[model samples]
Structures are given as C-alpha cells and as structure tokens.
Target chain A: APSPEEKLHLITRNLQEVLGEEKLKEILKERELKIYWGTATTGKPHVAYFVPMSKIADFLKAGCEVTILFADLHAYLDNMKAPWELLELRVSYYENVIKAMLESIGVPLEKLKFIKGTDYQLSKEYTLDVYRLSSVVTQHDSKKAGAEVVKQVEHPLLSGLLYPGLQALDEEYLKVDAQFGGIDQRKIFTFAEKYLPALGYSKRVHLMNPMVPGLTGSESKIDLLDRKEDVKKKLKKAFCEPGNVENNGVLSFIKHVLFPLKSEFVILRDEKWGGNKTYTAYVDLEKDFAAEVVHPGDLKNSVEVALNKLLDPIREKFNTPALKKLASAAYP
Target chain B: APSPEEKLHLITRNLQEVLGEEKLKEILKERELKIYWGTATTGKPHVAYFVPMSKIADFLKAGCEVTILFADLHAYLDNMKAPWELLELRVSYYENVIKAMLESIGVPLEKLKFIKGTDYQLSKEYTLDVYRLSSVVTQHDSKKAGAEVVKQVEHPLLSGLLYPGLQALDEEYLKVDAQFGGIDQRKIFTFAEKYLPALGYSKRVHLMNPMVPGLTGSESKIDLLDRKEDVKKKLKKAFCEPGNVENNGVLSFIKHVLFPLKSEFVILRDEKWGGNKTYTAYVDLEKDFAAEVVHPGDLKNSVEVALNKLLDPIREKFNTPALKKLASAAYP
Candidate 1:
C-alpha cells in the first residue's frame, strides 16, 4: 500500500491547487474521501478532459469514493448547443467513453457512481435550493462566476446566471467531499464556497487541475475523436521551441498525461543520434530537453508514439460498430 | 345565459385593453374560456386586489373557468420577502381573502380554482419549459418585461429575470386561454404572448385592468386591508378637484369599482347643501361632480360609506379568530 504522503502526492500531482489543504489532510487521516467530477456533455470528449479523469483514478486508488456528474442540463443551458432531444444520447456516449477511458487506465469502474443532471436538478428539493441561492446571488456575481465557461453574447440569456447556481447546488446534492475540475472552473467553485453555506450546506474542497495546452499550440486543445494521423500531425507542429520550457506543449503533455500513466517513456532514434533512451522521471526528461541534448523532432516523435499508446484502448473501443453509431448520433 | 355581447362587456369592463380582442371574441364564440389571475401573496390583500377579483367574478358569470394563482414562489424570488417557511401561511391568507371577496360579489365559490406557485411551478415539466424559455429570452428582454413589477436594485438578483419566464410558463401550465392582472403586469403578459409560442404553447389573450388610483391621488392605490379609518382619511383627502375629471381618484373609483357593483350611487347630504342626490351611471355622476352640483364633502362622505360597505364582508371574514391568526402570521 502507498503511504499517506505518497497518496497525497498522487492526489495533487500535476494539479494547480487543492483548496483547503489542511482540511484535505484531516479528511485523508480520518475516513474515506468522496470526490465529485462532472462534465457538461456537449461535444466529444477532448484530451483535456483526461486531465481530471486521471485525477479521478488517483482518488480511486487512494481509496476515495468517486461520483461522476453528466451535466446534460448545463449543456442545454449553454446556448442550447446540445439540444434537449439529443441530451440523453450525448450523456450516454460521454458516460460510456469515460468509463472505457478509466478502465483503460486501470481504475475500477464499479467503484464510481454516475449521475445525470436531470436526476436531481429537476427535483423540488434541488430546485428550491437553486431558487434560494439565486435570490441571494446578484446577476453581477453570477455573471462573473460563469464568465469563463458560460457563453456571453451582447445580451446574455438568464441561463448564464442560473448555471453557476446550479453548479454550486450540485456539490451539496451530490454529497461529495471534494470537487474536481479544470482551473477554468475556479470562479464557479469559489462561488460555491461562498454561497453554499448560505443554503445550509458546508463547502467542499476544490481540486483544480491545470488546463492542458492544445496539441497544435496553446490556442486549441486536442479532441479525443481526432484521427491518429491528426494527433501525430498536430504534435509534430506543436509549440515546443528548443531550450524554452515555459510554453512547451510537448513537455506539458508529457508531464500532465504521459508520465502520470506510464512507468517509463521511450524514444526510438537512429544510431547517428542519441539512439534509444528511456526516462522514468519527468525531471530528468525536462533537464535533458532544456540542455538541448534531446532534439525537438525526437521529442515530438516520442510524444506521438506515447499518446497513441495511451489512446490505443479508446481507439479500439470506438472502432466497434455500436459505439461508433453512438458517437455519430451524439455528434450529428 | 348572457349574450356574447354581454360576455364581452363583462370581460372588458373597466379593463384598460384586452389584447387581440378578435381572438378573445373568437374564443368566446367557440367554447368556454379559461382565465388566470394571480397575485404574489407577500402582503395582505389591499383594496387594489379587488380589481382582479371583480374581473374573476365577471369571468365566472360569463361561464368562463377561472384560476387564481397565489404566487408564493414569485414573492420569495422578488426579494425573499415571503420566506419559504411562511409561504403557506401567506398563500392561505391570500386564497381565503380572494375567495371571500368573490363570494361577497355573488360569484359561485365552486366555479373558481385556487393554485399556489409551488403546485406546478416546481414540477419537472414546468421547470424544463422555464429553462427552455430562459434560453430564448435575452436578459434585456426579461428585465424589460419585469421592469414594473420586479424590484429594481443597482445590481438586480437573477430571480428578477427568472420571474418573468416562470410567469409566462404559468399560462401554459395552467392551460388558461386568457390572463388577467393589473396594467402594471402588462409587460410580463406581453412577454408571455411573444415567447410562449416558441415553447409550443399558443399565445394567451391578455386582459389588462386599469390600475386604480390611490385614495390620495394617482400616485398610490387603495389597499384592500387598510383600516376603515385609514380608508376614510385617505378618501377625505383624495384628489377630487371640482370640475376636472382627469386623474381624479374619486371619479376613477366610482367608474371602476362602484358602478360595476351597484345600480345607483346615492349621495345623502344635509338639506343645506344638496339633499340626497342619486346618479345611476358613472358619466352622470362625473357630470354632476364636474358641474359642482355635488360638493366634494358629500362626494367624499358617499365614497367612504360605499367603500366601507364594499369592504365590510372582507373585514368581517378576517374578524374570525382563526383567519385573524392566519393574517397575523402572514403579515408578521
């Protein structure tokens, strides 16, 4: 069994911040931790979504109870990108794909609980709580809380104001100890911390994960449904300048995704270059890359190979005719 | 049975406008009309609430189904003035008072239906419609719709936006063919006409009653629950300038309230002034007052007596200890 320190390390690895660290430590010492991670199932899952899934795996291995929320209502509220008629299909696809991905990474699927937004959001109890919170939260406060995720038009819809309140209530309704999401969701979770108590609910710890840079560059992220060749091409042209580590997309992927899953990263090179080398730790890889000992071509090539390997199970699962039909139905 | 012309007259009497009169006439010709009238039960029923209740009596007499909605949720959302804990008490008081007022006006109690906001507003079907409408209605549209009835603050709460959508949906959920409220609610009903069709529900006919001027002047309206002394004082000081009909409080009440209920308005004056003059129609009363044939003191005295007589039944109903207890709890 991993020691408590190792468990804590795994929980916070490659993450931005875990709010209320002291509370987390006490939770870790006393009993089993309950964590909630949700996604608004709008489009196909992207590689960035894997950031939180990996964190979920970490929590599961650390003996925490995990619940996944499929925010179908939120997707509908988000400019109606996912229409109500198609939400059921989209949510099912999301749940299936997420389940497959977690299983591919060796997380126990049976240990996690999955819930859809309509399960509780439409209930009288949950809706009353939403109204109570909405009465207290100003439109300015709601707009600011949802600025990052909610679509803003010249004249925003009232749904933009409702989304943050719904998200905050989800924490109390789901009965989780910690919430997991990308750092872009920081404002909403912060709102939950401030407003949930007013509705007689205790605030949960927020585990914020860093936003992964897109494969092409920092401008866009990689879509999980992208063909393997597309992934390779994007990574080959990724923004990884030589000896500059600050905005390196390839290094970011390696640190946030590849190294967390794989025991060792292998690079296959010709005899003229530094041949084949394996590195188990991210620090060693970063040091060599910073010193220009490893060329960008070799780094990109290794990243492509490792990403394909990581995504191999997902690719195989989607190749099945049934799942392929689901994806088509969800997207179309 | 009343003639179609009489039914139309009953529906539109003292009302500012019945939006789409052609549609209302067609509805009247084909089938029994369904009408909805509601009030947010945050305070005691003021004399002004009688305007809609009287309209409800007209609808019942015209063989239309009437539903009175005690808008407890709207009251809660407005400013949390009627907290959820006490909403039941507030709504019960409103329902009891409205029923008594209708019965005193000779409308059959069995013909009217009373609904609370919590009844169907919190249902899944109704909530989904609210969200759907919220997506289509812009913040500017919602703010505009609620401008008069919604409380305005520097930074308004999100509930102000939500109230209009909920009210619009209430028409469809209640399955009413016509909606009745004071002219202050014109914009919100107009919003319902413009937006309900987008949700697959037909537009409802809006019957807007003129807002009664306060006994003091056009600046305020009479409260139904005001003490008899307060009503008398306000009427004595009302804006009843001798030959001016425009913006006259006594004239408005005589035209809207007294004429609808009684066959004749009798003024009993000491022989010194004009002894016991009686006018059958509002126009004749206005002409006599305008010509100074009826002095302001006699008019004021006649108004106080007529107003108190009109409110006597409502006052007596609350005089019972059980209802008095309910009033104390609701108002407190």
Candidate 2:
C-alpha cells in the first residue's frame, strides 16, 4: 500500500549515508523496510538526542517499521558507564526522553517497538553467540570496531572488546533488515558485516548519519529539559560568525534541523534589514548567509522563535514533576 | 575425631606445595578444610589425570571435603577447545574417567561434590559479578592470570581472556575454603587474591599439587583404561637408564606414584643378582638406583606390578559396554 521508491527517500531522508543500498532497495520493493536505531543508556538524554529523534520521525513518515534498542547491557559493560544499580533509571530516562522527542516531532508511535539489550545479551542462546564470536574476533579488530576507548590504563578489560561482538549479535537477535545509527558506528557496522557471516548469521544493511554536526560554545548544548528561558539564553549566546559557515551553530541547526523538518525557514526582519526572506532549501540560506545577506542578530532571533515552537511539546511533557524528579536524581 | 596435625601431613602427602598455608592451618584448626579441583573439559581424560587424582586421594584422606568443578564454560570460551556441540560428551568423559580413577585410588566419594562451571557461570547472579569484576580487572592481569596462551593469531579472542576472570568467580561461587590444582595454576591463584578483595568477596586458600611429577616416556603413560597387555608393552618401552634417575620414566613412577601409595619400594632381582630388596622410603630407592644397586629392569618390573594392582579397579569399571560405547562414540 506504500510507494517503494518514496520509502527509500524517507529512510535516507536525513541520513548522511546508507550501506548495502541495493540490498535496501531489494527489501523495500517487497515490503515495508524493517530498521532499528540503538541508543546506549549511558547518560541523560540532552537536546542532541533530537538529532536522532528528528531522523526517527522521518523513518516513520516513510512507512518503515522502526525499533528502538535500549543498550542497557552495553552501558553496564563499559564498567559503571551506567552503574548496574541505576541501569533501570538510566534506561527509563532514554525511553521517557526519546518518546517525548518523537511526540514533539509529531512522529507517530504506532509501528515502533522497544527492546532492551539485557533481555537478549544475557540469554543462553545469545551467550553462546557471544562465545562463538569471541573465537573469531581479534583483540585488534574489537578495539578498532568500538571506537569508544577508555582512559589510559594497563591493558583494557575483556568487557571492552565484548562490546562490538555484542553489537553484532544485536542485529541478529533484533532481526532488523537494516541498522540505522550515527556515522560514529561505521566501524562497528563494518565489523558486524564480517563476523556475523562467520557465525552463520545474515549480514545487515547499515544506515549512517551525516546530520547535525557540532559546535564549541561556552554556553552550548540545548538539553531536552533545559527550560524555555534557558534555551533562548543559550541560543543568544551561540557562536555564529556572520559570513563563515565553518563552525556556525546557527547554520547547523537551520541547515540540518529546521530545513529537514519543515519546508520554508522564515527569517522575519524588523524594519529594514532585508525585510523578510524565506529559504525553500538549505543551499539558498547558506549562499545568502555567506554573502552577509542574513545578519547574525536576525538569524539567532528567527532560530529562537523556530526552536521555542519545536521545543514546546517537550517543555510541556518534561516540565511535569515526574521528569523533573528523574532529571534531578540523575544528576544528583 | 581426627588429628589436625596428622590431617596436615596427609594433605601435604604426595603434593607439591600449598598457597595459603596460614589460612589452611586456621581452617584446619577449627574444621576440615573444603577444597575444590577444577579441570577444563577440553580433551579426553588420559592416564595423566591420575597425577591429580592421586593428590585428590590425599585431600580426601586428610578429611578435607572436596569438590570437582567441570570447567565446561571455560572450554567453550576457548573457542571450541571442546566444541560447543561436544560439551556434554566431554564433561561426561571427565566425570566417568575421574570417578573410575578415584575408585582405583581407593578415595571415598562420600564427602565430594561435582559441580559444572556452566551451572553457576551462566546464572544471573554470577553474570552480574562477571561485569562487576571486569570493571576493575585489567587485560594485563587477566592475561597474566591464565598462563595458558593460545595459537599465534592476529590477536586472541576476548573469550581467551575471560578464562581467568571466570576462574576467580568459581572460587567465590563454589564456596570452597581452598582451591586445589597443579603448579601451573599458581599465576591464576595469585591473581584471584588481588581481584577478589576488590569485589568485596572473601579470599580463598589455594592448595597446589606437588606430587607424582613427570616422565620421559617413549611409552611412559599408564592410562587407566589401557588394556593389561598394552600397559605392559608401554612400560617395557619406557626410558629408565641404568643408575640415571633423572628423567627416567621407570624410577619416576616408583618415587612418585608407588612409594607415595605403599609403605615400601621393592625391587625383586633374579636368583644370582641379589634376590629381593625392600626400601622403606623413596630417598633409599633413589640412592640405590643412582648407585647401580638396583637394575632398571628390576625397578620397572616392581613399579608395573604395583601399578597393575592400583589400576585393577579402573580396568574392571571402564571395561564395561557403557563406557566402551562412550569411548568409541567420542573418538568417532
């Protein structure tokens, strides 16, 4: 009942890259694509989560059935990344915050399913696979696959190497057609491709992200729970050097978040500074901004307005006493 | 009631050394020391097992409660040291052969228990401890602890490293006062001390076997299941040089296995040579053999007679059709 051609665009909508493109195309022609996005429940979810959440919204609109894997065991195996005692709270925060992000994006929660890594990683069947993979995976490859290296210590924990192998098995156990993740996971995704076949499991298509790059601000990072007044203050204090689009936070948000989510990015002007300009796409905004046509003052102001509206749903949901408690307890 | 001092003598009888001597003395003063000996279910048990079984005989005679740990998970983790499919068969062989060995040694089984590593290693409680221990233990210590290295590869498996950590946890979970095994396990025993304390677990006394050391056998091994004729043929082919006790397979059997078991080491000579000679202790036999007082042929004959008598019980048991069936099926 859906257009296979159109579903491809929706999946690749905000993604930077996709592995196994032909394989994805083959699957799409037959049925709705099955994809999964995993988030390690290490720390509190901040506004940066919106980067993935916004992409998740596109996955749903494109008619792909999405699954969210809460990497609880992965967090624990990192040795107090999320303390074993508090794993439940941390996982709950990822779930509670991410669901709120989806709701705010207006992405329907209908086809999405939630799974926890501990549910499978600790099972007898998965235990055997973990052993089987360890047989073939080398220490160098394991260290390479998982790029999240720890502080300097005498030889790392075996648990550190176990991380990538568990990740490979996750794809097998989740039964997802494709794994949607950030570009940071390309190494891990590439590793899974080689080892899964050795274990007699099928290989999976990996979707990488090229969206919402970074910034270096003394007062940056718009957290999901950061209040309305708090957000406006941070945005006003962001680094947006007029013509240079190099590390511009304003350009990044407007180019990646605003343009991808909505059609026209309205830059309303006061009195005379180029009256009003509406960019149908990111390129026009980039060219004009680089030429000093779009002032930083106006750009920051227009962004604050767009963000307040986009962030409104989350503000309402998280402002409740329950989230406020989790937010405070997590930090405390 | 048993003599604590005599119990110590028996425990140290036919043994190499003990790790926690003070801890063993403390426990023995109050009650019988509880000891566990673990064997990885990797290959078919051969006559070499009798070395440990003989020491285990001492442990039982000393009134120490003993447990045998079948390291089935350890084997699986070593990447098909015992193939995952063959785990049950291998474990059964260890249990079947070791028991037949105990019967041969005349060690009572009443105070002994058999536990499998998988029984506890795969449990949720033990699983949490695995993660907790991994948090503090470094790859350096783990690699150092398990002295058993593997075939040269690009890099070893994470499972190879997990071997030591699992061994540490086995001490805690088995609830044994001390661990008993070969001197090869000294590195492993020393490692458990530093790590176990960090996990808020009690440190255990580690008892090492020093008895029945070695031989240079063109045909030295006396397998518990070897046919009577095969045993004689192998013993006949053994390397026992005249007046050379060092690396002499015949003299090694007399000094380690025979004299340790029986009160006297007897060498029966032909009518003209010297008739029959009886030495009360091993040092006496070693002196006589090294000085050419006892012929190599006479020494080999004496040890074989004693071994056949000791091996008689095992011969009767393993000769059964049931064991014959397992032995054939295992090799096939």
Candidate 3:
C-alpha cells in the first residue's frame, strides 16, 4: 500500500488546485475516502473527459472509493442539445463508454459506483436542499458560478441560477468526502465549499484537474469518441506552432494524458531526421520543443498516434451496431 | 343554487380581474369547480387576509370546492420573520384563525379543504415540476412577477426567483380550476397563464381580489388578531380627511368590508348633532362623505365599530391563552 504522502501526491497529480489541502491530508489518513466526479450527459464524450477520467484512476489506485455522476438534469437545465426524452439513452451510453475507457486504461471497473442524476437528485431531500441553498445564494453569484457551463442568452433563465445550487447540494446528497472536476469548475466547487456548511453539511475537499484544450486549439476540445482520422486531422490543425510552447494542444495532451499513462512519448523518424526520439517526462519534451530541437510535425505525429492508440478500445466497442445507432442519434 | 351569471358575479365581486373569464364561465357551467387561495403562514393573520377570506366565502356560496394553502416553504424561502423551526406552529395558528374567520362569515367549513405547503410541494413529482418550470421562466420575469411580494435588496437571493414558479405550479398540482389571491399577485398569475402550457398543464382561471390598505392608510395594514382597542386606535388615526375620498382608509374599509357584509353603513351620532343615519351602497356613502354631510369623526367612529364587529369573532377565538401564545410567537 502507498503511504499517506504518496496517496496525497497521486490524488493531487496533474491538478490546478486542491481546495482544503489540510483537510485532504487528514482525510487521506483515514482507512478509506469517497470521491465523486460527475459530468452532464449533454453531448458526446470527448478526449477532454479523459483528463478527469485519468484522475479517477489515480484516486482508485490511491485506495479511495470513487463515484461517477451522470448529470442529466443539469444538461436539461442548461438547455444542452440533448432533449429530455433522450437523456436516459445518453446516460446509458455515457456509462458504457466511460466504463470501457477506464478498463482500457487499466483502471479496475468493479470498485467504482455509477449514479444517475435522476436517481437521487429528484428526491424530496435533494429538492429541499436545492431550495435551501438557493435561499442563501444570490442570482449574480449563481450566474457567475455557472458562467462557463450554462449557455448565455439575452434573458437568462432561472435554471442558470438554479444549476449551481443543485451542484453544491450534490456534494451533500452524494455524501462523498471529496469532489473531482476540471479546473474550470473551481468557482462552483468554491461555492460548494463556502455554502455547504450553511446547510449543515461539512465542506468537502475539491480536486480540480487541469483543463485540456480542444484539438482545434484552445477554442474547442477534441471529442474522445471522434474517429481516429478525425482526431489526427484536428491535431494536425491544432495550435502547435514550432518554438512557441505556450497554448500548444499537442504538448498539453502529452503532459496531461500520454506521460501520465505510458510514462514516455516515442517519436518514430527516418535515420536522416535524427532517427527515433523518446521523452519520459513532459518538461524534457517542453524544453526540447521550446529550444527548437524537436519539430512540431514530429510532436503532432506522436500525439496523433498516442491518442489513436488510447482511443482504439473505445472505437472498437462503440462500433457495435446498437451503440453506433445511439451515438448517431445523440450527436444528431 | 345561483345561476352561472350569479356565480360569475360572486366570483368576480371586489376582484380587480378574473383572467380567462370565458374559461371561468365554462368551469362554472360544470357540476363543480375547485378554487385555491393561500397565505404564507409566516406572520399573524392580518385584516388584509380577510379580503381573500371573503372571496373564499363567495366561492363557497357559489357552490365551489375551496382550498386554503398554508405556504410554509414560500415563507421560509422569502426569509419572513418566522424561522424554520416555528413554521409548523405558525401554520397551525394560521389555519385555525382562517377556519374560524370563514365559519364566522357563514362559509360552510366542511366544503373547504386545507393543505400545508409541505404536504404536496415536497413530493417527488411536484419538486420535478418546480425544476421544469424554473427552466422556462427567466430571472427577470420571476423578479418582475414577485416584485410586489418579495423583499427588495441590492443582491436578492435566488429564492426570490423560485417562489413565483412554485406558486404558478401550485395551480397545476392542487388541481384547482380557479386560483384566488390579492391583486398584487396579478403578475405571478399572469406568468402561470403564459408558461404552464409549456409544461403540458393548461392555463387556470385567476381571481384577483382588490388589495385593502392598512388602517393607518395604504402604508400599513391591520392585523386580524389586533386587539379591539388597537383596531379603534389605528382607525382613529387613519387617513379620513373630509371631502377627500381618494386614499381614505375608513372609506375603503366601508366599501370593501362593511357594505359587502351588512348591505348598509349605519352611523350612530348623538341626538344633538344628528340621530342615527343609514346609507346603503358604497356610492351613496362616498357621495355623502364627499358632500361633507357625514363628518370624518362619525366616519372614523362608524368604521371603528364596523371593523371591531368584523373582528369580534377572531378576537374572541384567538384571545384564548393557547392561540394567543401562538400569535405572540408568530408576530414576535
């Protein structure tokens, strides 16, 4: 078993911030800890989701209980492209793909608990908590907390204000000791940390994983379920200008996904182009790229190959006729 | 039994508007109609409450099923003077006083059903409906709808926006054919009429009774449980300037309360000034007061006596030690 220090290190790996670090260390000393990470089942799962999925694996390896929340109600509230009737299908699809991804990445699936938004979120207790939290949070604060998640409009709906409160209360209802989400969720988790105590719930430790930029660049993200060719095409068009290390999607993918999983990134080249190169750490690759020693083309090719390899199992499993039908319906 | 026209007149009496009058007529044409009027149960029942109570009498006399909602959740959400712990006591006090008031006014007690806000509002189905409605209603519209009721602050809580949607959905869950409230609730009911259809619930007929000014003027209203001496004192200090019918509390009370009950206003003056005089109908009383035939003292005195008579039963019932304890706690 890993020591408490090692466990804390694993839990905090590749994250922007761990709110309540002292509390997290205290929680790590216990026999077991429970962590909840959720996603709104609004669109097709993308490669960016793996940023957190990878963190979930670390949590499991560190001997923590993990739960995945499929936030269907939140999607409906946010007016995502998914209609209410199709939420059930989308949730089922999400659970399947997520399970397959975790298993393919060598994370054990049997230890994880999966929950749907409608299962407990629609209960009387949760509804009351939502109302209670809403009483404390202001319209401006709620809107700001959900600014990134909720779609903006001329006249924003009350649901926009209601969404953050529901998420904050989810920490209480899920009864988890800690929460996990992308760094963009800092505001929401911060809200939960500050307000959950007002409802008689203790503040929870929040693990905010680093956000991965979209394959098209920082503007959008690449879909994990995208076809291998599409992934390569997008990565080719990604923002990876040579000698400019900042805002590079290829380097981010390598740092957040590849090195964490494979422990090394290998680039295949002809003997004329300095043969094959290997990078076991992100800083070494970043240094070489910044120094103009490693070309952008080589880096993009390696990222494409690595991403395709990572997505191979997912593509193969979703290729089944029934799952393909669901994907088409969801994306359409 | 009253004809449909008579029933319509009774329903519309003293009301600012009955939205969807044609639909109300159709509903009245049926064998039975259901109407709901509610109070928040956060403070001592005031004389203004009797406006809707009197309307409930009209509804009962017109052969309709009536329900009175003790809106405990809304009161809590609005952060009324009553704390969450005392809501039950306050609701009980409200229910008892309302029942006694209706019975004293000769409205049949057995025909009316009383529901607490927590009774069905906390149900899974009703809670889901609240969330669904919140998605469609905008923050601006809800703020506008609840402008008259919600306390204004620089940064209002999200509950301010949520209260109106719950009220709008109450029409659907209560299964009432018609809704009743003060004219101040016009915006909220109009919101229901506009949005309930989006949720697959039909629009409801809304009976908006006229709002009554406080005994001191339009600024403060008389509490239903006010002592007889207090009622007289407030009326004595009321805005009853001679020959000025506008903004006169005494005249408003005579028009809205006394004339509806006694069919006449009788002023008892000493034989030296003028013997006892009787005037029927509000128009005649207004003209006499405007022409300076009736002095302001006599008007205030007669109003004091009429208000005391109106409140006698309530005072008698709530004066008991147990109910008085409740009122003191609620008002405090």
Clashing pairs in 3: A46-A224, A47-A224, A214-A220, A214-A221, B46-B224, B214-B220, B214-B221
Q: lDDT tens string, model 3, B150-195? A: 7788887887888788888899888998898888889989988888
CA lDDT, every prediction? 0.81, 0.77, 0.80
Tens digit of per-residue lDDT, candidate 2, span B290-332: 8997888788788778878877887787679998877766555
Best by lDDT: 1
Model 1 TM-score is 0.92
Off by over 4 Å in 1: A77-86, A218-239, B78-86, B216-239, B271-274
In TM-score terms, candidate 3 sits at: 0.90
Could you give candidate 3's per-residue lDDT for residues A1-332 as a string of tens digits? 78999898878888988888888878778767789998878677778777778888888878888988998777675564456668777787888888878877787666699988888988888877787787888888887788786778898788778777788888878889899987888888888888898888999998887767755663245676778777877777777788877887778777877777867888766678788788887788889889987888888888788888888888888889988888777666
Model 1 residue pairs with clashes: B46-B223, B46-B224, B47-B223, B47-B224, B214-B220
TM-score (0 to 1) of chain B, per candidate? 0.91, 0.92, 0.91
**Candidate 2: residue A60 Cα off by (Å):** 1.8
- The sequence of per-residue lDDT tens digits that candidate 1 reaches over residues B1-332 is 68788889888888887897888999878888898887777765566666567778888888889988888776766656545668778778878887778867777766689888888888888877878887888989998999889877887788778888888888988989888988889999999999998888999999998877755664244566667888877776676777777777777767776667765788768888768988887888888877888887788888888878878888888889998898888777
Model 3 segments beyond 4 Å from truth? A78-85, A216-240, A272-274, A291-293, A320-332, B79-85, B216-239, B270-274, B304-308, B319-332
Worst 10 residues of 3 chain A by lDDT: A213-222
lDDT of 3 at A157: 82
